[PDB]
């Protein structure tokens with residue numbers, strides 16, 4: 045760790061040190077003491093089938109033995125993958141990358157080049173690349189990117205001179221943005237006649253066998269986390285003209301057969317919609333059980349989202365700190381301060397286990413914070429962590445300014 | 453099947469009409485096409501398969517990792533400690549980091565070094581990946597991103613390094629076929645005198661020749677390796693000076709702890725750290741090179757070979773010879789990385805070497821009598837270096853002749 049220059053997002057203890065897990069299977073991880081934990085983090089939501097899913101593993105092992113193509117060259121598995129992507133997501137053309145970061149940078153640069161226009165309006169996280177960094181919201185960074193924090197009043201201001209705007213790129217959230225938000229988003233962008241890049245790295249295939257909302261009409265999409273059960277594959281597709289500059293993309297590992305095996309195998313399953321409905325059902329039991337447990341002990345922690353993708357909304361940082369300590373004590377591995385994303389290995393027995401552990405958390409919290417209330421502050425702070433901008437709750441510009449001051 | 457759906461144009465073996473060649477299986481140094489015909493691979497996923505297709509030790513490690521047996525993607529595991537320790541031991545440096553492509557690593561470190569140096573200009577030679585930050589319309593002046601392409605010309609470099617308060621870094625992809633020892637000593641001198649840090653892009657050459665970076669005649673502040681790290685699995689690594697790499701604290705990606713890639717890199721690096729694979733490849737490749745030189749000389753075929761058994765290149769008299777050579781090679785099932793470098797893997801062992809020598813004899817026969825009169829010229833050498841190393845071959849010229857030679861080749 046001393047040696048590592050980077051700071052990977054991962055589970056960390058109270059001291060900030062990465063939590064070590066030495067094996068895992070399905071929904072369960074094992075720590076170096078042999079204790080078993082239930083994983084709701086699941087490699088930031090990229091393990092959707094379950095750790096060690098055997099169908100994926102068999103495919104990867106066959107590919108590792110050279111039976112399913114070579115890294116040197118095109119293979120039939122690639123044809124199958126590209127075909128599957130276009131059937132499920134749509135679009136004229138498709139492309140592949142190793143990370144969501146890479147996919148988002150490449151498509152944003154390509155669409156900007158095709159549009160010959162300098163400004164990109166953005167909300168949501170799009171990866172680690174410095175092109176997205178900015179010192180303040182609502183004004184262009186040095187790369188021409190304007191963060192609008194899912195504020196449609198700001199978006200409307202920017203779209204009021206739409207000829208300088210190349211694209212609008214958003215990472216759709218469905219915990220804190222509803223049908224009204226999407227209807228207005230799409231109204232605005234269609235009025236401006238500016239293309240939409242839907243960054244569905246997290247939500248594409250998450251809820252259903254396809255992109256997350258028919259309320260967006262994207263010119264370009266990206267999916268990744270739900271594509272390959274954690275193997276490093278991201279895909280993009282959409283309009284051929286907008287993605288013309290993708291002709292310049294090539295990378296050494298393009299034909300690597302294990303990644304292709306993982307993606308073809310996982311996509312075949314996700315395209316049925318079965319895993320997503322299993323996960324929704326099981327997650328929904330856990331959320332219903334947890335919401336009740338907490339309500340009845342007077343613990344000031346609510347939940348947002350659904351079985352596929354949910355989050356805890358704590359009254360304050362003190363509640364949250366105590367909640368995380370108690371959860372870790374019961375071996376519940378949540379993505380702290382962010383979204384929870386069960387896999388298809390979160391089955392009914394695991395739900396029963398997890399519900400026991402959350403009874404024990406609720407007991408560990410009872411009587412301590414009863415005098416505390418979930419306020420609008422709690423909600424905005426929680427949403428900010430999980431979806432990387434402002435919740436769709438009614439507000440004036442003065443309020444928007446005050447919330448940003450608190451959370452930036 | 454799906455060519456028309458694909459927005460990208462991946463580098464891959466293509467037939468004479470530009471259509472990608474399909475291969476269904478591989479094993480060691482051999483590929484199998486859809487009709488079962490067996491080809492010998494010298495391309496090896498652009499030199500990233502260094503142990504051989506389907507290497508069993510790597511395969512077992514990947515398979516176990518795929519069942520979660522040494523860790524999961526959610527979290528840190530002991531395998532990561534092993535890999536980071538191994539990397540620092542073999543390549544050196546204060547700190548290390550991991551990426552999924554050479555492209556990603558090169559962009560991240562370049563941006564980080566520039567940030568640390570508070571200087572906007574970066575001098576560059578060699579290929580560093582597909583990112584648009586490297587695109588330019590002309591050499592020798594800065595592109596839109598502050599990057600000056602210098603095409604391995606030390607006259608141009610020295611002019612830029614006379615601005616030491618403006619130049620953040622010099623990033624080079626070292627070549628050892630078309631740049632001599634004298635080039636490297638002048639390069640290191642210029643950069644030391646200017647006190648400008650060197651980023652050694654060793655994505656191709658790092659661990660290629662020995663258990664370490666490719667030349668002691670460089671002293672880089674930052675290194676990148678990748679192709680020799682994981683037998684094709686998508687892993688790149690960086691390391692070096694902690695201050696210069698401070699901005700890497702901002703890097704995280706979802707698949708960081710993905711266990712199959714980590715298994716491949718740890719297992720492959722353990723072998724490459726011994727130097728044994730590189731020694732085996734050098735011997736076998738050197739036998740092949742010796743045989744091919746003699747065969748072409750015997751047949752009056754005007755193609756020279758540069759490099760060594762780890763990494764070599766064909767230098768054809770001209771493009772008609774090269775096209776004819778490639779068509780003849782494909783007809784014998786030799787798969788070369790056309791116009792670029794050849795990089796055998798450690799599965800290119802003695803019986804495979806014998807097979808490949810046979811195929812080369814047949815190539816020589818198919819070329820005999822067709823080009824006997826033609827000769828390599830300096831233009832042959834320039835053209836070949838421009839393809840394999842992405843810059844100007846190290847051969848005497850005036851500053852005025854550089855300009856002319858670039859017009860020709862740009």
Ligand SMILES: Cc1ncc(COP(=O)(O)O)c(CNC[C@H]2O[C@H](O[C@H]3[C@H](O)[C@@H](O)[C@H](N)C[C@@H]3N)[C@H](N)[C@@H](O)[C@@H]2O)c1O
Pocket residue numbers: 053088089142143144145146148168169170171172215243244245246268382383429430431432704705706707
């Ligand atoms: C929509 C979207 N687009 C591109 C990417 C980049 O993909 P990749 O990680 O493969 O490069 C992500 C990667 N997702 C990782 C996390 O990102 C955000 O969280 C953090 C992220 O964990 C952290 O690394 C970063 N420094 C700040 C950022 N706010 C989200 N809130 C979280 O739900 C996600 O799991 C994404 O969610």
Ligand SMILES: Cc1ncc(COP(=O)(O)O)c(CNC[C@H]2O[C@H](O[C@H]3[C@H](O)[C@@H](O)[C@H](N)C[C@@H]3N)[C@H](N)[C@@H](O)[C@@H]2O)c1O
Pocket residue numbers: 294295296297463498499552553554555556558578579580581582625653654655656678792793839840841842
């Ligand atoms: C030094 C160096 N640094 C970063 C990279 C990028 O790594 P990655 O492909 O993992 O993103 C490479 C990737 N190497 C692929 C090839 O690139 C170059 O050739 C082509 C490259 O194959 C091609 O894709 C590109 N469009 C033009 C480029 N000139 C080299 N001559 C070749 O020996 C290489 O095998 C490299 O060699």
